[PDB]
From a paper:
The primary mode of resistance to aminoglycoside antibiotics is through chemical modification catalyzed by aminoglycoside-modifying enzymes. Here we present the first structural and functional studies of two aminoglycoside-modifying enzymes that do not use target mimicry, AAC(3)-Ia and AAC(3)-XIa. X-ray diffraction studies reveal that these enzymes bind aminoglycoside antibiotics in a conformation where the central 2-deoxystreptamine ring is in boat conformation. Similar to other AACs, AAC(3)-Ia and AAC(3)-XIa display the GNAT superfamily fold.
In contrast, all five structures of AAC(3)-XIa contain both protomers of the physiological dimer in the asymmetric unit. The AcCoA binding pockets of both AAC(3)-Ia and AAC(3)-XIa have a similar tunnel-like conformation that extends to the aminoglycoside binding pocket, and our structures show that the overall binding of the CoA molecules is conserved across all of the structures. In all our structures, the highest concentration of hydrogen bond interactions between enzyme and CoA occurred in the pyrophosphate moiety. The greatest difference between the coenzyme-bound structures of both AAC(3)-Ia and AAC(3)-XIa occurs in the positioning of the adenosine moiety. In the AAC(3)-Ia structures, there is a shift of around 90°, and in the AAC(3)-XIa binary structure with AcCoA, we see a rotation of the ADP moiety of around 180°. The flipping of this group can be attributed to the solvent-exposed nature of the adenine binding pockets of AAC(3)-Ia and AAC(3)-XIa.
Numbering used by the authors:
A (entry chain A): 4 to 148
B (entry chain B): 6 to 148
């Protein structure tokens, strides 16, 4: 019931619902049109969504880098519904992210995370991700436009 | 001034990225010029050049939050002898102008915490490390 699969265009509605649940949990805003945009992204772009049943997802983008022949991957969104956490779903999603980007010969996986999100940080650290390069923490700066 | 690099400019861009990595003692892969020539040719990334002394490398990728892309300033560098004279400011100003032509919904930049001079530069030009009272971190795994 919760095996990991690659989302198809017709799955955009389920992905959108999970993203809304994610934003609702963290009291962050949602634009209209998530479903339509996910449908276009899944069909046409260098990006994919993995679904665990209807209870978790991972949204990955692939973009060019001069450092590698393959892309740099970014896990833009990762979410497991609260009642299904601490059961290995997130581990299985992340393992499948690494499996799928390996098919594309991706040179790196990147993930941005809030410092306050200590559970997610411990999860990523325990599954082979680091905040350190050249002996320094790495920070994300943004400007919304 | 600042110009959008062409495939013919791949040698210059590669040289600057090499110089950047040499300055900070970080690894340089082979084939940078050839890879930049391929990347410049395609439609989801671009390089801005300040003469032959500075560059910005920007990627564009999809997001479900906007019709336009999320832009990332994956590399920004001005040659040491030309710093502190507004070149970086001009490059970043042109980054915003070019991604606006793509209706990009956000610009993202990852930077090391120890690069305090670069962070002061980004903060002075409208970038923030804070959301919901929390700093934002980058995690990676090299593959
Ligand atoms: C770019 C971004 O999206 S960054 C923000 C990341 N997303 C979020 O924070 C959203 C809210 N959180 C979540 O959705 C989840 O907390 C996630 C996605 C971070 C992790 O998902 P989960 O399904 O909880 O992960 P999983 O169960 O595999 O592992 C969590 C812990 O449970 C442990 N665990 C696994 N199976 C079991 C089990 N049967 N019994 C008890 N503990 C278990 C794991 O070992 C892990 O511990 P660790 O973090 O100390 O290594
Ligand atoms: C995604 C990334 O590339 S993150 C890393 C960014 N790149 C680097 O740090 C490389 C080293 N530095 C540089 O190449 C340049 O100095 C840049 C790109 C940071 C700024 O370019 P400049 O042409 O110096 O910018 P400009 O003259 O418009 O503004 C000056 C500000 O640049 C910053 N700056 C100047 N020298 C340096 C330096 N050696 N290292 C970092 N930041 C610097 C300071 O904040 C300075 O402001 P101050 O007068 O308060 O010190």
């Amino acid at each position: 019931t919760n095996e990991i699969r690659v989302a198809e265009v017709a799955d955009a509605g389920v992905v959108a619902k999970l993203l809304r649940d994610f934003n609702t949990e963290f009291d962050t805003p949602v634009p209209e049109g998530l479903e339509e945009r996910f449908a276009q992204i899944i069909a046409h772009d260098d990006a994919f969504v993995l679904l665990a049943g209807d209870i978790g997802f991972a949204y990955v983008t692939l973009r060019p880098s001069p450092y590698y022949d393959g892309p740099v991957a970014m896990l833009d969104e990762l979410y497991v519904a609260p009642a299904h956490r601490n059961r290995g779903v997130g581990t299985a999603l992340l393992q499948r992210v690494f499996e799928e980007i390996r098919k594309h010969s991706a040179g790196e996986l990147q993930i941005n995370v809030d410092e306050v999100d200590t559970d997610a940080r411990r999860f990523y650290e325990r599954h082979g991700l680091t905040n350190i390069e050249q002996g320094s923490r790495m920070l994300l700066y943004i400007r919304e436009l």
